[PDB]
Amino acid sequence: QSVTADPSPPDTNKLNKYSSRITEPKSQGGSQAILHGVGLSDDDLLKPQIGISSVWYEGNTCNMHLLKLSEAVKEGVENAGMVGFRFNTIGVSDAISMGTRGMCFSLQSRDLIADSIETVMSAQWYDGNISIPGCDKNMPGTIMAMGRLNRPGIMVYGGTIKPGHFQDKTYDIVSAFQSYGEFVSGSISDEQRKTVLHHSCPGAGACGGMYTANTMASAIEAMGMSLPYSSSIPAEDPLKLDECRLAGKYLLELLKMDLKPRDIITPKSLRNAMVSVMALGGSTNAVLHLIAIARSVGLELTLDDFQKVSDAVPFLADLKPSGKYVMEDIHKIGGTPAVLRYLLELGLMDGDCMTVTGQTLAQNLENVPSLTEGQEIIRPLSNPIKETGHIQILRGDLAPDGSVAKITGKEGLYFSGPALVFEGEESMLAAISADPMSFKGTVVVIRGEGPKGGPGMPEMLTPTSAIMGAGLGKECALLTDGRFSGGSHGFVVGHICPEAQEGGPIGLIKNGDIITIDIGAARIDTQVSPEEMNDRRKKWTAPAYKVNRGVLYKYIKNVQSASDGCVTDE
Amino acid sequence: QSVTADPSPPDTNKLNKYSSRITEPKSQGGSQAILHGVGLSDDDLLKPQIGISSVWYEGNTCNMHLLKLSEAVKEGVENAGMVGFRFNTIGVSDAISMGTRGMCFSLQSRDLIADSIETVMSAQWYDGNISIPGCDKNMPGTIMAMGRLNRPGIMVYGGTIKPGHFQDKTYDIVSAFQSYGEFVSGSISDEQRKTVLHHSCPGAGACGGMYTANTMASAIEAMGMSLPYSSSIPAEDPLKLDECRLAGKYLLELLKMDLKPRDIITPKSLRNAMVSVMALGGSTNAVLHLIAIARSVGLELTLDDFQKVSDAVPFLADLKPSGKYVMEDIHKIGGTPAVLRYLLELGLMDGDCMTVTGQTLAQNLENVPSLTEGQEIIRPLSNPIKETGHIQILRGDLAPDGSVAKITGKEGLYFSGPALVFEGEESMLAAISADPMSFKGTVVVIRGEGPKGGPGMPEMLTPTSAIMGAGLGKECALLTDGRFSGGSHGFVVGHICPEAQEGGPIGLIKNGDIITIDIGAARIDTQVSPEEMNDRRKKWTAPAYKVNRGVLYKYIKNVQSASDGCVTDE
Ligand SMILES: CC(C)=C1CC[C@]23CO[C@H](C2)[C@@](O)(C(=O)O)CC[C@@H]13
Ligand SMILES: CC(C)=C1CC[C@]23CO[C@H](C2)[C@@](O)(C(=O)O)CC[C@@H]13
Ligand SMILES: CC(C)=C1CC[C@]23CO[C@H](C2)[C@@](O)(C(=O)O)CC[C@@H]13
Ligand SMILES: CC(C)=C1CC[C@]23CO[C@H](C2)[C@@](O)(C(=O)O)CC[C@@H]13
Ligand code: FES
Ligand code: FES
Ligand SMILES: [Mg+2]
Ligand SMILES: [Mg+2]
């Protein structure tokens, strides 16, 4: 819990606790000369300095607008009497890289982003931070950096993309991904396929459903580290620019209070974040990212913590991918604060947690308009979509250190079938192409896709959509030490630990082993005896790492297990 | 030498070898929908995609102009028939962080930059790269990423800052750093001190002397990975913008030739780079960065390689800090190509190395105007400033795995003195404050500043300027496992390996040990017997790491020794 990462300030009530290190001593005249050179007056040197870290880049719709938002954040910082210094990190697009080896680089970019913002804040002695992520992994990456530094900070979510519309039909990135399967199946022509591709993503913003971006944005708001409505204002909405211009005012107040990320991110605000995930049907990736965020502030968060919140919180929101609505429809019925107000009224949330407004969650939500009368997106507690949360933690013989599944309650309580084992996604997809019926009734195992084996713990969508299009949805189960993206109508488990590369039982499974998934017992078991499994283990040798240089070899050297949130700095 | 880091392309003569992975298969319609959303037409999808990676940020003069350069690079990429996708990494300012704990974050940002550009190029499937660094570590960071990817790439140096001028007096960042010592000594008043600070850095650009930025920029041009004149055109010069607009034309040609970084960065172009360092009196940091660059392409480069080139190449350039002129004065006498033309004419360089112009170094230099008649910056081979290079590799008892020193030839051949040992820069500076005369005649050892002990292998300037201001310049020697920045008029050695944190002999030195530096034997020796040293070693226990989380704990876990270039991905 005693984190030692970044420099500590060189007194109370001082607003420039860190930048005074370089703006005040005569022995740092070199630093002051650079600062004059970038435009600071003598008066400016007395002011707090805010690092404004955006994740702009031009090759992704989620991120191409973030420089325009960064300009607005800087203008608000200046209007609040402080100095704004913009800088920008990298990010990668899951939508672009999905289905390719580029996806091996996606999860780790969260931790690269954390390292990047930490590096700049520490070296330049900035007093506070405003981050503008726009896309899946960007968000937890910025919060992790704020937790390590423990300097006042606010996350401004870039906002969600608007749905595409063409000829009385609604299209999104899900439409684009689905289009190829509908072409091969014969449902649509090549001409209809191309139309979907040209009208799926009309502008800037993150993916609209309850995928990782909106899950994490909502969760981070719920955790108190974004301003109210940050998660539900669309990316191109003029209110997003207004939020950007106001972050500086709110940050000034945080500096006056010295309200820091470790004052805001606590066991109870972490639970608030998890409640929001459960209630909205949020992504299983939130397990990885919330664990990493909790670790970044010196706290603990286990898989069991997620299971307890899941048991305690019903799934209430009729939102894609599980349901029919998108983040804009939440926005039109009162936004994320309206949802959280309802959950707080139900006693599911703790209102006493401090937030980046300088007030408590309860104080923020006191004044917010409630959910729109007659709305059908957020179900009553009396009529939930599921009595408990979607997220389910499975252990048992084959996942002794844990695993994560999204369970709707429609797949049944059990699946038993002979294992069909693949060393990588490629061999699985080839086998289901040549011989789809060989999959009927099996427990499909795609191993070697974990943090070290993948490497990079890639997300895989093609296995579930291939299973769906072969008519095998409820007829087989899918297990991996990596991650699955789309929903089957059957059992789909990821994050199996230990991963195959580490010699976990998943790497000892053989074709024909009878595997039994039991949701009530929360176990993925094998009919193979523990003694024969141990025999296989004694004979097992770890495969060679797939890379020997570069960022992914460093990831292999540094990354902890999926049950440990794949943190890299421990 | 067999590097496995990044994805390989999914045919010859194809110009979009990598982006075809996502622009051509119907199974990647999701990728194509994102690309349409960011503005690509169907015709645009057929074009090569260039990742344009700048290191812009607002808090440093070296980097604040790089977004404007990035816009020009993109416009040139489009004018050459390709698609330009801008993205931006982080960087840190050595001028701002020097003298503070922020400096522990500076060297590692080179390797963070390499990881960042590698990550984006791999995930987004870009065909080529144009990088726009502006500051010390940025430059080798971008080349390392290009070496790992081995996709056609060009480095555009951001260019050097113009000298500040006020009331018939020339000021630079060196003036600003010197100002405090001149205030404490009484040479100048507080009023004169403040004047230097306001007129030292008038605009955008890297430091003007032969510090790391200009050393590396020149070295990277000499290595063939920048266009001719990139290193010597000033940052605000309109020709820099013209260079930016032309990089796309040159990159198109590289894609047609499939001339890749591992075709350009070879043993012989690495030697060309080292020749340029020796001849210009370049920074000892170039030892670290050129080793890392050579490793990134699967090549070897040792400390002995530097000593052999140093022995073979005289110091010829009258350039700060060793001399009086700056990079702009090279620029006014024909620039870096004119210098390299002279060295090539002397037979010091290999002209057959391919470069990013698509032609050889000799072909580039055939047409360039020679050095301005009557110039006094570049000495003749008959009258060099030093018969061999400044860079000197020392081993011996106390640096068995090597060490690096800048030797002018003025300090003599020997120094012998009792050791005065400090565990960190702070205790050294306090001791020389309270008791300066206790330093007279000693060999000052500042240990625990290496890659893992510092951590971060920080650069330290205050020890040499404190020694200078106490009148002790030629009266003591300075040794460290970290790095020293400014020049003493005596012996100053850095990069001592193994570092103290790793239990190298430097961590076993005690106050009073007689240390003898012998330049001719190239040895740093101790009078203590090898048997007593081994006794000390058997009793020695490694100190606890100073951090336990964050980017610097990861650095500690990953970094190799200074003699190994402090690479992190092996
Ligand atoms: C960030 C780095 C490089 C550090 C090395 C060891 C210390 C230095 O002082 C200690 C620990 C610290 O608590 C402070 O007083 O500032 C924080 C900073 C770190
Ligand atoms: C399931 C399909 C159709 C997706 C559309 C684009 C994304 C949505 O969010 C992104 C990419 C994803 O990384 C997540 O957050 O889960 C994976 C899933 C796919
Ligand atoms: C970059 C990553 C994650 C890789 C994992 C193992 C391989 C895959 O194929 C091999 C090696 C490769 O030579 C290719 O044919 O493309 C390069 C890419 C890497
Ligand atoms: C020696 C003094 C006065 C310097 C002025 C600013 C810089 C120059 O270059 C930068 C910072 C440095 O990182 C290098 O490249 O060596 C260290 C040295 C100091
Ligand atoms: S790919 Fe960026 S939020 Fe979906
Ligand atoms: S600090 Fe950037 S080049 Fe000197
Ligand atoms: Mg994702
Ligand atoms: Mg430097």
Author numbering:
A (entry chain A), B (entry chain A): 3 to 12, 15 to 574
Passage from the reporting paper:
In this work, we solved the crystal structure of AthDHAD–AA complex with 2.0-Å resolution, which provides the critical information for the inhibition mechanism at the atomic level. In the dimer structure of AthDHAD and AA complex, the active site is located at the interspace between the N-terminal domain (residues 1 to 388) and the C-terminal domain (residues 394 to 573), formed by 2Fe–2S cluster and Mg2+. AA was observed at the active site and the substrate channel with an occupancy of 0.90. AA fills essentially the entire substrate pocket via polar and hydrophobic interactions. The carboxyl and hydroxyl groups of AA are coordinated with Mg2+. The β-ether oxygen of AA participates in the formation of hydrogen bond networks via W. Hence, the closely positioned [2Fe–2S], Mg2+, W, and the residues T216, E463, and D140 all contribute to anchoring the hydrophilic side of AA in the active site. Extensive hydrophobic interactions between the nonpolar regions of AA and residues that line the substrate entry channel, including M102, I177, V178, F181, Y215, and L465, are observed in the complex structure. Such nonpolar interactions are not possible with either DHI or DHMV and rationalize the strong binding of AA to AthDHAD (Ki ~ 300 nM) as a competitive inhibitor. Binding of AA expanded the active chamber by pushing outward the residues forming the cavity, including residues I177, V178, F181, G490, and E463. The binding of AA moves Mg2+ about 0.7 Å deeper into the pocket and changes the side chain of coordinating residues.
Dihydroxy acid dehydratase (DHAD) is the third enzyme in the plant branched-chain amino acid biosynthetic pathway and the target for commercial herbicide development. We have previously reported the discovery of fungal natural product aspterric acid (AA) as a submicromolar inhibitor of DHAD through self-resistance gene directed genome mining. Here, we reveal the mechanism of AA inhibition on DHAD and the self-resistance mechanism of AstD, which is encoded by the self-resistance gene astD. Our structural and kinetic analysis of the mutant AthDHADs has validated the hypothesis that larger hydrophobic amino acids surrounding the active-site entrance enhance resistance to AA.
